[PDB]
Design a protein around this ligand. Structure first.
Ligand SMILES: Nc1ncnc2c1ncn2[C@@H]1O[C@H](COP(=O)(O)OP(=O)(O)NP(=O)(O)O)[C@@H](O)[C@H]1O
Ligand SMILES: Nc1ncnc2c1ncn2[C@@H]1O[C@H](COP(=O)(O)OP(=O)(O)NP(=O)(O)O)[C@@H](O)[C@H]1O
Ligand SMILES: Nc1ncnc2c1ncn2[C@@H]1O[C@H](COP(=O)(O)OP(=O)(O)NP(=O)(O)O)[C@@H](O)[C@H]1O
Ligand SMILES: Nc1ncnc2c1ncn2[C@@H]1O[C@H](COP(=O)(O)OP(=O)(O)NP(=O)(O)O)[C@@H](O)[C@H]1O
Ligand SMILES: [Pt+2]
Ligand SMILES: [Pt+2]
Ligand SMILES: [Pt+2]
Ligand SMILES: [Pt+2]
Ligand SMILES: [Pt+2]
Ligand SMILES: [Pt+2]
Ligand SMILES: [Pt+2]
Ligand SMILES: [Pt+2]
Ligand SMILES: [Pt+2]
Ligand SMILES: [Pt+2]
Ligand SMILES: [Pt+2]
Lengths: 803, 156, 78, 77, 48
């Protein structure tokens, strides 16, 4: 360390050039060659603005390089010519004559401009260079020279990484190392990151950036500089690409989303794009020389949690709040389980960031309430003005009620307005502490990079200790403040999450554990009877979690047998809702229809699952499916994964697979009439199954549940739970709906059917009850809040309000 | 009305300068009378062999009809009245197929009244049966009778 | 939310007619016809339908009644 | 330009009513450093302008928070 | 129908009449946005 990074890089550039052309003495021509890249190049500008036309200079300078000897191995870039060294050291003498704390590239041009006979002298040159109005005594790690195409349309990540500007990227050593490896390859050195949006592809790149600055990266990249390009257009683009090649691989270009400089073997590039977007790129044999794909897969919740904890600091600092670890876990979990759009890394963060935003919008909480009383005060404040002028002396001068109110309000106002100042102030210091508490962690890490553990110790002791506690007291000072724009918690997260789905009562509260234990209850709240089914399904799922089954399989797979309209689909639906907080988590495959190019029409399935990992998948009439499907299916039951059309497999490990069929129905019923032993039925029914299903299939089934006919009472129970909604609906109008047992029984009667089951009940309840009730409501007979009384009688149900 | 209006700007203008003085006599005393004076004359015309200061539905329905069709319906019929006579209206154009009408009618009535998920169409049906015996007709007639125009139909 | 969705088809037509000739119970027809439907429509679909209305053939009288209502426009236009 | 905050001051503007969110939202965006220039996106006739002139009235009444308390809204035509 | 010099002299003279004078343009905007100048037009469709 001693010279600015600018000039510093310029030297390395010249040095690498010497090597490339196989030279022995790093002479001036080398430094020139790299300094005079474009018309935009500072060396070019400054020089042209002084007089000497740079092009001719560069032109003639390269001529010399071409007229030099070709050495070998240990003689390449062996040393620095006396002339160069002399100029280099003369450049330092010129920086002191200007006050620049370092040697910039322009001060370096003067020196060389001196070591080069034929162009402008100090007098002319210092004047031109001076024509950039000060600002060169700045820092060394960044002189900030915005002249060249790269500096014009590109962000220098390695720079930010140098000044600790980049966010701490954590948990992607493997991907980084792979990227590093690829850059060293001779054949394919241009790695392209292939991944889904939000996964953290760019992170990988900037992560690598930081390592370079720390020397954490191997040789050959040790001094490299990573520049991120950011989308007559091609005029400048070329100005950039052609400027990176002149850097001589000493500068890696990173495109977040050509061949002439590439195929030529001089343009080191790092890409990043979608899977399918890269597949197309894999159609240009000249380009698709395999950019060394590096598929960045979406982090797991645990990893995501670590990542969030990493940036934990930054966010709560750049935004001034306190993000509890509790909330972090929520952002990762809740998103990964109920946010079908974006993918983990991203969405989890967006959640934390977006939940906090509302606390900012929550700043205008004072004015609102303060002014709310203000106006309200003026109301009575002006009202008195009328009661002060009395025509009723001993009847109007009794406004002691209104006058007292003014005082109170004048009090509450003086209260909150001054009380608010506390929060505001307590924040004032806090935000400052979090900043110095940062400037310290920056200062410390800094020292711990230059063994100056002197400071690294005096600070990590006492100093740091203070802030940490100071910025800890200030937070403890803002407990239940009227303006709590600090702690971000689960509720906050759950809320914004509920905003995209439904009920924080569950999203939040409910823990998989609590949920899985009450599972049989919940299910019964909607599915009447069929106890055997619930138990089996519930136990299978419980057995699934807890980790007692192969991780490479669906959470649970079942085959529902038995009659029709007696529970199967309902249970399937209810399961989806109760287990995945929504009936939207269901995915049906009406097999009885896919009797054609089935296979192809599902890799649709993969997609639904793809967007909603946690979901219940229902396959109706499984026997009707053709052997082809059973393969895709069987592939789900085993290894719990599936390869779609494109290729990228979808994960089914988090799904529940329910399959229905009526194969044993008749026999099952028969067994119930003749009332023979359940075991006798199951065995008899199994034989049948063995005639339409491959054993591999029947054997990979967690359970073979058998649904049975419903009992008169069961129906009634269904009628009740069925009425629930109507009620919850009529509730919106404060309208109550009480029915007679006779009424209920009537619905039960008409509702159920031997062969159709409880399918009819709905139509019945609709016609016999809802239709009439509707007419009364429209007619006005049933108003708001009324308690509608329903009873039987001739020709059907009868209604009565009150009376 | 002009005073009452001027008086309203008047007051509000005071509840800004805090001149509670003016604002006082205005809000209390001024506004009271003026508001009663106008309400007095208004009522003073509750009967007018040559006047009607009122703007009513008919008036609205009319200018609306002027941009569409028949005030007889636009006006007169209210959703309630309309939904109750629904089966009649439909039969004025659709002969027979009674089962169809009732079903559709009841569905729609059951729809309003709020007994169904708000996030659904007012009613969805599947017309089965022979050809040219009512289906499209009923569909057309429904559009007209329910939406005051056959222009409310959209075929696919 | 403010629209009415009508869907037509002839899937059960033949069977529906047959059920009327052999004059068997309406319920027997609806059920027989539904089965057919279950073969060309996803249950999710048939289940989200507010109603599955069945139109039937017209009677000589109705036809005359239609003639009348049909004549109406003519009367009107004249 | 037509000074809406002035027309509001004199009480010339008609009563905008029923748009607390949108207004408050604008009140918000009109204080955010990154993006403080709020654009109202909506169909013709919905009442976009009303929102603005509605906001105008609040300013004149002090109904608006701090930082806009004395501001003046000018409509360029 | 310096052009606008006289045009304004006209429009500003109609407003001083106080709506007691309706202006008719066979086949201006500014003194119409703030709110003033009673006008009756006539034109093809596209324009409007
Ligand atoms: N490994 C990580 N460490 C820290 N932050 C990360 C990490 N991965 C992703 N992020 C965050 O996620 C957002 C996008 O990260 P980025 O690495 O650019 O991913 P992306 O997949 O390229 N996005 P896109 O360009 O939209 O496809 C930023 O807010 C990051 O902070
Ligand atoms: N055990 C039950 N608990 C609650 N509701 C039930 C039950 N059994 C049947 N139902 C009702 O019957 C209808 C469908 O029930 P479901 O169990 O999904 O049968 P299905 O398999 O769809 N037969 P189908 O509709 O005839 O093709 C819904 O209206 C349910 O409310
Ligand atoms: N029930 C009915 N009442 C009055 N007119 C009817 C009736 N049924 C059929 N029609 C007449 O028949 C024609 C078409 O009737 P419609 O009910 O729309 O049948 P369709 O199934 O749509 N025929 P198409 O669309 O040609 O295949 C019209 O001219 C109607 O007047
Ligand atoms: N919230 C409101 N309160 C009172 N009047 C309103 C309201 N919103 C709209 N209006 C009225 O509706 C008409 C148009 O209002 P405006 O705010 O200009 O909406 P628009 O959709 O932006 N049309 P335009 O500005 O012409 O493109 C005016 O007559 C307004 O008075
Ligand atoms: Pt060479
Ligand atoms: Pt050196
Ligand atoms: Pt691009
Ligand atoms: Pt906000
Ligand atoms: Pt808000
Ligand atoms: Pt479902
Ligand atoms: Pt089938
Ligand atoms: Pt299928
Ligand atoms: Pt009267
Ligand atoms: Pt039509
Ligand atoms: Pt003109």
């Amino acid at each position: 360390e001693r010279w600015t990074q600018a000039a510093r890089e310029a030297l390395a550039q010249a040095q690498v050039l010497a090597q490339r052309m196989k030279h022995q003495a790093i002479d001036l021509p080398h430094l020139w060659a790299v300094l005079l890249k474009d018309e935009r190049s500072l060396a070019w500008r400054l020089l042209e603005k002084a007089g000497a036309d740079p092009k001719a200079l560069k032109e003639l300078q390269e001529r010399e390089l071409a007229r030099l000897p070709k050495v070998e191995g240990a003689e390449v870039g062996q040393y620095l010519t006396s002339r160069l060294s002399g100029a280099l050291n003369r450049a330092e003498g010129l920086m002191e004559e200007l006050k620049d704390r370092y040697v910039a590239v322009d001060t370096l041009v003067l020196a060389l401009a001196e070591a080069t006979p034929g162009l402008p002298g100090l007098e002319a040159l210092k004047g031109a260079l001076k024509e950039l109005r000060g600002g060169r005594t700045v820092q060394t790690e960044h002189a900030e020279s915005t002249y060249n195409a790269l500096e014009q349309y590109g962000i220098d990540l390695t720079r930010l990484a140098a000044e600790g500007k980049l966010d701490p990227v954590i948990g992607r050593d493997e991907e980084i190392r792979r990227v590093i490896q690829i850059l060293l390859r001779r054949t394919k050195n241009n790695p392209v990151l292939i991944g889904e949006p939000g996964v953290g592809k760019t992170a990988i790149v900037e992560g690598l950036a930081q390592r370079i600055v720390k020397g954490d990266v191997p040789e050959g990249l040790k001094g490299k500089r990573i520049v991120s390009l950011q989308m007559e257009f091609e005029e400048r683009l070329k100005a950039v690409i052609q400027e990176v090649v002149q850097s001589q691989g000493e500068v890696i270009l990173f495109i977040d989303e050509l061949k002439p400089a590439l195929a030529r073997g001089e343009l080191r590039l790092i890409g990043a794009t979608t899977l399918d977007e890269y597949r197309e790129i894999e159609k240009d044999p000249a380009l698709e020389r395999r950019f060394q794909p590096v598929y960045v897969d979406e982090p797991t919740v645990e990893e995501t949690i670590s990542i969030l904890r990493g940036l934990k600091e930054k966010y709560e600092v750049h935004h001034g709040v306190r993000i509890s670890d509790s909330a972090i876990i929520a952002a990762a979990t809740l998103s990964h389980r109920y946010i079908t759009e974006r993918r983990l890394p991203d969405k989890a963060i967006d959640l934390i960031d977006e939940a906090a935003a509302r606390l900012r919008m929550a700043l205008e909480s004072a004015p609102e309430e303060i002014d709310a009383l203000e106006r309200k005060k003026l109301q009575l404040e002006i009202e008195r003005e009328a009661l002060k002028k009395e025509k009723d002396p001993d009847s109007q001068e009794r406004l002691k009620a209104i006058e007292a109110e003014i005082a109170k309000l004048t009090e509450e106002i003086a209260k909150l307005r001054a009380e608010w100042e506390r929060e505001r102030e307590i924040l004032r210091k806090l935000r400052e502490a979090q900043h110095r508490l940062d400037e310290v962690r920056r200062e410390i890490e800094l020292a711990e990079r230059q063994y100056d553990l002197n400071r690294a110790a005096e600070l990590r002791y006492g100093e740091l200790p203070k802030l940490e506690a100071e910025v800890e007291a200030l937070s403890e000072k803002l407990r239940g403040a009227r303006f709590v724009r600090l702690e971000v918690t689960e509720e906050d997260i759950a809320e914004i999450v509920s905003r995209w789905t439904g009920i924080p009562v569950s999203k939040l509260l409910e823990g998989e554990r609590e949920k899985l234990l009450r599972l049989e209850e919940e299910l019964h709240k909607r599915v009447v009877g069929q106890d055997e089914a619930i138990r089996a399904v519930a136990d299978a799922i419980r057995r699934a979690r807890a980790g007692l089954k192969d991780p490479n399989r669906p959470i649970g797979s079942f085959l529902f047998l038995g009659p029709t309209g007696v529970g199967k689909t309902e249970l399937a639906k209810t399961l989806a809702a109760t287990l995945f907080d929504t009936e939207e988590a269901m995915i049906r495959i009406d097999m009885t229809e896919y009797m054609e190019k089935h296979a192809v029409s599902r890799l649709q399935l993969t997609e639904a699952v793809r967007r909603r990992p946690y979901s219940v998948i229902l396959f109706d009439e499984i026997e009707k499916a053709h052997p082809d499907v059973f393969n895709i299916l069987l592939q789900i039951l085993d290894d719990g994964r599936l390869t779609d059309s494109h290729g990228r497999t979808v994960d089914f490990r988090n799904t529940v697979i329910i399959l229905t069929s009526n194969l044993g129905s008749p026999l099952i019923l028969e067994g119930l009439q003749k009332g023979w032993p359940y075991e006798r039925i199951r065995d008899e029914v199994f034989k049948v199954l063995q005639q339409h299903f491959r054993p591999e299939f029947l054997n990979r089934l967690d359970e073979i549940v058998v649904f049975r006919p419903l009992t008169k009472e069961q129906i009634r129970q269904i009628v009740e739970i069925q009425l629930s909604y109507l009620r919850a609906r009529l509730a919106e109008k404060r309208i109550s709906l009480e029915l007679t047992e006779a009424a209920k029984d009537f619905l039960a009667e008409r509702g159920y059917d031997p062969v159709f089951g409880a399918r009819p009940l709905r139509r019945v309840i609709q016609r016999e009850l809802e239709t009439p009730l509707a007419q009364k409501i429209l007619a006005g007979e049933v108003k708001e809040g009324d308690r509608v009384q329903v009873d039987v009688g001739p020709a059907g149900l009868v209604f009565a309000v009150p009376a």
